Write a protein that binds this ligand. Structure first.
Ligand SMILES: CNc1ccccc1S(C)(=O)=O
Length: 93
C-alpha cells in the first residue's frame, strides 16, 4: 500500500497551463527556504525549476508514465523525460 510522498519520489507534477511534467520530490537543504504547510518542493526535470505543490497535483511516475511520458513541444520537456528515465537522482545544480 502507498506511503506519503518522501524526498526522492518520482512523479509527474501538474501545474495550471502546463502538461503533467516529469519531476521529483526534492530534499530541503539545511538553511534553505522551506515549503508552505502541506506542500512539497517539486523539482521539474528539464527546466530544472522548483515549485511547491500538494499531493492533488502529484502523480506517481511508475503508474502514470504510460499516459504522461510522451514527447511534448514545451521547452525542456523532452530533456526532462530523459532525466527522469536515465538519471532521476542526479544533481542538476
Ligand atoms: C548547507 N547549510 C550550511 C552549510 C555550511 C554552513 C552552514 C550552513 S547553515 C546556514 O544551513 O547552517
Amino acid at each position: 500500500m502507498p506511503h506519503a510522498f518522501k524526498p526522492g519520489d518520482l512523479v509527474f507534477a501538474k501545474m495550471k497551463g502546463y502538461p503533467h511534467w516529469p519531476a521529483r520530490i526534492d530534499d530541503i537543504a539545511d538553511g534553505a527556504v522551506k515549503p508552505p504547510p502541506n506542500k512539497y518542493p517539486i523539482f521539474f526535470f528539464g527546466t530544472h525549476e522548483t515549485a511547491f505543490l500538494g499531493p492533488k497535483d502529484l502523480f506517481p511516475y511508475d503508474k502514470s508514465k504510460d499516459k504522461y511520458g510522451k514527447p511534448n513541444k514545451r521547452k525542456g520537456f523532452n530533456e526532462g523525460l530523459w532525466e527522469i528515465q536515465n538519471n532521476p537522482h542526479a544533481s542538476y545544480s
